[model samples]
Target chain A: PSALTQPPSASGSLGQSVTISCTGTSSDVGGYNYVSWYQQHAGKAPKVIIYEVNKRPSGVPDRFSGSKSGNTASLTVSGLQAEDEADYYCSSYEGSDNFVFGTGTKVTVLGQPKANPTVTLFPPSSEELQANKATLVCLISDFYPGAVTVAWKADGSPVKAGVETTKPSKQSNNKYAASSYLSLTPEQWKSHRSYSCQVTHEGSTVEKTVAPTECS
Target chain B: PSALTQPPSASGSLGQSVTISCTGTSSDVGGYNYVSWYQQHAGKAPKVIIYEVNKRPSGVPDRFSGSKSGNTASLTVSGLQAEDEADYYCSSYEGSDNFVFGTGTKVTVLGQPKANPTVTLFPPSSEELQANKATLVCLISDFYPGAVTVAWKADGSPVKAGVETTKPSKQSNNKYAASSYLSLTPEQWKSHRSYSCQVTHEGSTVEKTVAPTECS
Candidate 1:
């Protein structure tokens, strides 16, 4: 019924052929080939793996491939390498002006080790911020082992804890993931206070602090 | 000189904060915020995690956060979960119509893990054989785990492979990603011959078979 059904994790040797499938219920893939793929290394940006069914963008190796059936779409990465050990994802464009993300998949490269998580926070740049109550968002892209949490802390203490999170659902992909959100009052933000978004992964923890910006 | 750099992998618990950093060279992220994020599960399409730096598309939870500074962009998912153990990626649109993928990262969901070596292949329903050779093609999009090599095989033997690849140095968002163009000589594509495109990944292999179609 959901957009995709994927496994949680996967492993293979360098140069192996691996796939992360996205099975949709009755939405898009079954109707058309609007599926795509992406790859992300820890603490970095994601790269487009496949798009529009089987068309690889320029410079994409011959090893990466894609296919689609009645209602399902698949993205494949062939000739993997140590650098390929990271998270994989599939997505589809639902005709309803919205898109869906497959849960996610992590392809482990044999002999290649995993990396630790990274975190950072910052106030909005003057040109980007239009409001004080404007949500001070904290983002942690390029993460794996999706077992991290992001929360708002005021002066080293937990602030409002209201949150929302989702793991890569079997319908989404086979990856461990979560997300959270918090808002700050204009007064709380203007007081030159420091806010933090902390990440705790495996047994380690990291935090990022941001203070209100002074626009000239 | 790499497009971007990040850790190779990471992990965390549900409802926790996790961070993935994307540090671009001065040419990519320093002068722009046209960055995007995508999430995918196995066998599906990729979902846009973040676009234009910090703006979340509709239906994306607030728990998923994004921020940027100088040439660095980050995505933080709060409240990690078991299913969250997928892959995560960050992408940036450099100014010169170029895009780049970071080394990937894998997120593991502790227990109840899925099998290793996710596999995907695109099968062609029909192929037309005009000359002695028959041409079959497989298509894919939004691919990750860069550097793939697609090859043609006949009856388990390797064929002279041609690659029609594209290196879209910049995406609509000014990001750099790879694409390809693959072709085989018309002589190689023959009637009554079965052909396949073998996609390789880090030592693993998956394939899509194509059959020659006869004209009435």
Candidate 2:
């Protein structure tokens, strides 16, 4: 029942090596050797970069590796690729019938544009963004099983909203799971200075966000 | 990547059955909610029990389970009680970056003894009771880190012994590698009874076993 620990954030140059550590209590990673690592793109399903601790099954590149030390486990990716920009997570075996995932770590592009390309500019009376009309999705894009939720807000006010999640009947691997969303309007998206996508499991919550640059 | 699928293989008294299944292909289970299962006996690792092809992780008893179609997976165990000697395995994923395994399942006795003990005796012969000591001292347990030799003699006749054969490293977490040995008296273990060991990496054989198993 212990929470998994990860760094708030980290950065490394392309072709350089970067390592992330996942530390857990006896209820998770510390109690078993079934730990794994994952990679995610902006809006795509996360990919398994490692599995069962160290054995790289069939097609994993040699650059990505996994290791462990006591209750602390680590995933190291050498020769970092730009495509690696996304979210990364570390999970470990918990109990005889369960698993626990680390709060995700966002792997951002070192020198890429960080602007919200989805936003457009209109000269007139700056389009007013509304919380209900514009929907914001804080997606844990690379999660398995697709059992998670997103919350929308405007000026720090929680808005009443409808959330929908899906789990496809067929997927590539047994170790995969994903959750997605579809919200309406550009105002609902702008009204909320910050939007949050939270992952809740076993009564615990981990959230990521997308924020508006300036509220109209 | 593909998805992971598992099956259920639980066996026990009424209300006490256990579940077991197999782990599916990496591609199938690596990026989604796909997980697998398996069952096993005491002193042995768990075998395929209940798979994640179509099943529930919670609210489901230890007995009921599932698996993938093309990919083999399993899960087993139910009717929780003592004397149900066995082990179980459940596998899932954290995201798409890595695979996660459930902590090994060791079903313990949850009730009083259910039956009387019984024993059987079989006639023993010198050939069947002989103590065979195969001492293998290698500089490295895996990958011939050093050269080695083997010799054989039948009674007093010199037998044409093959080279040393090698096996995969023993599971040592992610730290050290390991190996094993095959020893039998030349006179007692000859012909039809093959005894061989070989050492090689890449393609060529460095040292051969006097009596080794076939190479790949």
Candidate 3:
């Protein structure tokens, strides 16, 4: 089962409409009515908008519709909103329990530039520390559209263990915030090593690093 | 937004090895290490065998391994057995919460002919029919290795309304069975039209059509 074909990008002005196409063949989309469409924003899970060709799942806006002709299926977004700027994907049930997903399309709203997020690193306070343990927090705030990626590094190497990152959540001010925590032993923290928190939003990266002396 | 590239078929004999390739580009498979592979039998959901490039999730057999070079990824099955004959799909995280799946590849384990499914269309029982409403069931049975596709048509046109389908389920004797139901109003059933149930398995199709008189 090969994935269906899709375009790389689709753009429209605010309040306008845009349509994306997914093309398959007789073995999949053309032969069956199992094509479905999904919408995904950065840092979130994909959600199904259309299933079984032209049927929309409950709670999906009426503005999002789907249709199919021959081997090609299409998703049309009517009255596109700024919040609708995201990625779209299509999937089909190929015979024999095989399912394939299309290449993804980026839907751009095409008007205002996005705002960059502010990042702050907070080292563990005295009362928050144990005899052999320390904690660090990376705070991301004021990001627009709520999609961002966060990562951690220790001594310039990626930190994979003892790290917990949260999905970007909407704040009261309509901005977005997320936090990542890194736990380390006192020995590792005071070894003159450096720890850094990196946040990526809208193609830009911002990072804050804490040295061993700063921890003390 | 092109899907990953894959060959349509691969074959191996018992005790031999086979490898399937999935190719993407710099923004997806090559730009990130989130390539994954899945194995699907007939009428079953796909199971992820390899994730994050070459790492296998727990409980996956060691005979299956994944690797990547430049923009292309590969899944290798060592010590292939008769049971390993199935379809395989590859997926890659395309960044920004978007993912793409490759077209499927069928792995053939040589030397035996497979059996096709038997299909039957059962009209609604007289006792179950309510004044203007009825249901028709399409039962697929005796399928080998458990994979099949079912579709419905009415009066020579594809029927999309009031149709429900189930995934193939395993039977006690190691065979498979799937069922699809179509609902109709009395007026449509009495219009002297035709209804058909089509089943596709192992590249062959079998259909059973019922006219108005046959329903009574």
Give lDDT tens digits, candidate 1, residues A44-84. 55566677787777667778889887766776777777777
**Top candidate by lDDT:** 3
lDDT tens readout by residue for model 3, B177-206 = 555566677667767477888887645689
Q: What tens-digit string does per-residue lDDT give for candidate 1 at B98-165? A: 55655555654443322212222222112112223222333322233333556666757676654333
Candidate 2 residue lDDT tens string, B1-216: 532332323335545655454444544444455665533342122233344556544434454555443334444445654435444555565454444554344544344332211111011112222433222211122232223232333333434442122222211111112222222343444333332333333344443222221110
| Deviating ranges (above 4 Å) for candidate 2 | A1-3, A112-216, B2-51, B59-216
> How much DockQ does model 2 earn?
0.02
Query: What's the chain B TM-score of candidate 2?
Result: 0.31
Off by over 4 Å in 1: A1-3, A7-20, A40-46, A76-87, A95-99, A105-216, B1-27, B30-33, B37-49, B61-89, B95-98, B101-216
Ranking by lDDT: 3, 1, 2
Per-model TM-score versus the true fold? 0.35, 0.33, 0.38
Which stretches of candidate 3 lie above 4 Å from their native place? Answer: A116-123, A130-138, A144-216, B1-216
Q: How many backbone clashes does candidate 2 have?
A: 127
- For model 3 the local lDDT of residue B151 reads 77
lDDT of 2 by residue, A60-172 (tens): 78878889899888877777887666667776656554545675655544552222111111110112132233323222222333233334343446554554332211123
Best-to-worst order by TM-score is 3, 1, 2
